[PDB]
Design a protein around this ligand. Structure first.
Ligand SMILES: *[C@@H]1O[C@H](CO)[C@@H](O)[C@H](O)[C@H]1NC(C)=O
Ligand SMILES: *[C@@H]1O[C@H](CO)[C@@H](O)[C@H](O)[C@H]1NC(C)=O
Lengths: 115, 115
């Protein structure tokens, strides 16, 4: 199904990182591994990632310009199921839900791809 | 790979329970679902379960009579990679590692099976 060390949920594979990068640097790596910063499509993909990820904040793959809709990796509009709190431009997961911060700060990250 | 709500690791599927049973009652359920109380074979299967399981203690599928070796579901000897602490007869996972307690106390549980 999924590579060693990668974890699978709902016909899917996610990497949780050991180190801390800024948001774009984290994108490049995920990509380098044929993958993307988690796209958090499902409400359960959220919960799963919250449960597995641990106490550190982790970048996920939503961003936005100041006024704008959260947009996925590719550039599309995010179907706004759950909140994304804060006033950042980069979306991250905290302990309990999704939130936002400046993209240049460093944070562990999660990678999404397929089986 | 694995049923809805079940999570996969290392060519494997695990259920994490929502409720609290005693050890044997937890065995019966896992079985009812063509599964066993996690057998914790790997050192990474440990870490994975610790990371996913959450703050509640969870029964896993090792037991022993008083003096004896930890024995799997079937009845065999457990290859003693990691500690199992305490003086219980039923093995459980706490926050940080494996431990042991009386089998009749109630605890969430984890189920192991295959893909
Ligand atoms: C992210 O950090 C890298 C260091 O690996 C650095 O080259 C770069 O300045 C940062 N990227 C952005 C967009 O600030
Ligand atoms: C476990 O609990 C069940 C209640 O579901 C009960 O029937 C039984 O007394 C308990 N089993 C053991 C081995 O104590």
């Amino acid at each position: 199904a999924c590579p060693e060390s990668w974890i699978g949920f709902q016909r899917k594979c996610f990497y949780f990182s050991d180190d801390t990068k800024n948001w774009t640097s984290s994108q490049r790596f995920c990509d380098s591994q044929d993958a993307d910063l988690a796209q958090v499509e499902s409400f359960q993909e959220l919960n799963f990632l919250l449960r597995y990820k641990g106490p550190s904040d982790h970048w996920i793959g939503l961003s936005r310009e100041q006024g704008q809709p959260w947009k996925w990796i590719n550039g599309t509009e995010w179907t706004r199921q759950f909140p994304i709190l804060g006033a950042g431009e980069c979306a991250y997961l905290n302990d309990k839900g999704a939130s936002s911060a400046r993209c240049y700060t460093e944070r562990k990250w999660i990678c999404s791809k397929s089986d």
